[PDB]
Design a binder for this molecule. Structure first.
Ligand SMILES: [Ca+2]
Ligand SMILES: [Cl-]
Length: 496
């Protein structure tokens, strides 16, 4: 369960947030596979309720009505095609499993669902599963409102309704089994693992009970006896009743402290300095590296009011965002997930984006296709951070230095730092309001290396900055505080 099951050498996964299956299939073949991405985290593939007010929000997909593979991203055939084609090019697929709850208890009875299935949330009836009133925690929750009134009581958090969503009685083997059957269908299709949604709202034991029933991965692509990779979304910034560690036995856990703290450091808030990152990782109170799934932002907190709040860096702050992502991908801590978003009309009212509900690019509810431009950029308002050179090259960097230890750290005592990964890679950052010009020990063999942030190595040449490394491993780094990308990274494979 802690092993990502990615093709050997691939070290990251991308969240192709709200993309259509057909588009992900193409992306695997044309980009992800060739570019060395380990896998893709897809949006919930199971049927959901249709929210017409607001008009088709991204969050309606976290309100299930059945387990039919039928959504705005596509149908089961399209899903199967995508999983096969991606596996075939060495790119794994991880499903976002929404198993803690069904739709909102206030939703009206009807068939306004992504697949036309009928449901009556008021009577707790989900005929397409099927689930009935006795499959929900209504009776367990001891809250007056039936909702989570206090996050300091682990019972409310687990047995009560999260923002009014119908809470499944996961202690029940019938419920555990319906869920297992769903996941098992996915595994058999060829899925490599799952993001367990809202883990904090389920008992660690109920999750384990469900995971025990899981099949081994499909031997068409995986070695026999392979267990699916599990990463649970548990938001724990410390000082809370429920802790991430309670979930360590089920698989990896999302480390939200990571993105919140790095955001604060790179933005230079609260007196934070990059030189403080010398002992980044467990040294900062983070979970063990072999249990962590890390990221700079996720689909929820990139919208401003998630774990980390305003300190979270997103594509909207491109320049600092790339520095943060670059730092993450170079550092040996945790297993990395890169975000790929779509842009929307932000509208702040008293410091709150009133348009954070906005769904993916669409034509009257129908999701737009992902178009690729000649410069490799995406059209239709898909941001495609995974396609930015600075990001794609750092994804590659991580693959290249994989397994090499953290070495040769250097800092100017303020916001200029540098470190390497054994003798395979080196990266330097200048986040100070002044010029960086120093000769540093890189740990790499002498030669001329292409900086993969400003350019690429094309044949026997570089399209950007070249760094000459002497035989003794030292090299001079000159980075202006006005540089578009205030950091340089070189590695074994960018050497001419
Ligand atoms: Ca629950
Ligand atoms: Cl997450």
């Amino acid at each position: 369960q802690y092993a990502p099951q990615t093709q050997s050498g691939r070290t990251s996964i991308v969240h192709l947030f709200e993309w259509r299956w057909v588009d992900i299939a193409l992306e695997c073949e044309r980009y992800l596979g060739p570019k060395g991405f380990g896998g893709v985290q897809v949006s919930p593939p199971n049927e959901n309720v249709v929210v017409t007010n607001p008009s088709r929000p991204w969050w309606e997909r976290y309100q299930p009505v059945s387990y039919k593979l039928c959504t705005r991203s596509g149908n089961e055939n399209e899903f199967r095609d995508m999983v096969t084609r991606c596996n075939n090019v060495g790119v794994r697929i991880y499903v976002d499993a929404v198993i803690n709850h069904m739709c909102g208890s206030g939703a009206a009875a009807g068939t306004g669902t992504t697949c036309g299935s009928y449901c009556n949330p008021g009577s707790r009836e989900f005929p397409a599963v099927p689930y009935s009133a006795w499959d929900f925690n209504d009776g367990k929750c001891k809250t007056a409102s039936g909702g989570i009134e206090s996050y300091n009581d682990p019972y409310q958090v687990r047995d009560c309704q999260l923002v009014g969503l119908l809470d499944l009685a996961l202690e029940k083997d019938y419920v555990r089994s319906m869920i297992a059957d769903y996941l098992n269908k996915l595994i058999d299709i060829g899925v490599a693992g799952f993001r367990i949604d809202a883990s904090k709202h389920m008992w660690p034991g109920d999750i384990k009970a469900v995971l025990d029933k899981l099949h081994n991965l499909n031997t068409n692509w995986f070695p026999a006896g392979s267990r699916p990779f599990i990463f649970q979304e548990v938001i724990d910034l410390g000082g809370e009743a429920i802790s991430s560690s309670e979930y360590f036995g089920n698989g990896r856990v999302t480390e939200f402290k990571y993105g919140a703290k790095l955001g604060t450091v790179v933005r230079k808030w609260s007196g934070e300095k990059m030189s403080y990152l010398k002992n980044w990782g467990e040294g900062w109170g983070f979970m063990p590296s072999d249990r962590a799934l890390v990221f700079v932002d996720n689909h929820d907190n990139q919208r401003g009011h998630g774990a980390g709040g305003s300190s979270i860096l997103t594509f909207w702050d491109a320049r600092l965002y790339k520095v943060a992502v670059g730092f993450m991908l170079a550092h040996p801590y945790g297993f990395t997930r890169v975000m790929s978003s779509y842009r929307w009309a932000r509208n702040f009212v008293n410091g709150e984006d009133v348009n954070d509900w906005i769904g993916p690019p669409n034509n009257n509810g129908v999701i737009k296709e992902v178009t690729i431009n000649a410069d490799t950029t995406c059209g239709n308002d898909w941001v495609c951070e995974h396609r930015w050179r600075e990001i794609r090259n750092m994804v590659w960097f991580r693959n290249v230095v994989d397994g090499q230890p953290f070495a040769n750290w250097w800092d100017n005592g303020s916001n200029q730092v540098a470190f390497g990964r054994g003798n395979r890679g080196f990266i330097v950052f200048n986040n100070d309001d002044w010029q960086l010009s120093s000769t540093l020990q890189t740990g790499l063999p002498g030669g001329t290396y292409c900086n993969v942030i400003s350019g690429d190595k094309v044949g026997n040449s570089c399209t950007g900055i070249k760094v000459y490394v002497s035989s003794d491993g030292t090299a001079q780094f000159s980075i202006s505080n006005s540089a578009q990308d205030p950091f340089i990274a070189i590695h074994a494979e960018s050497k001419l």
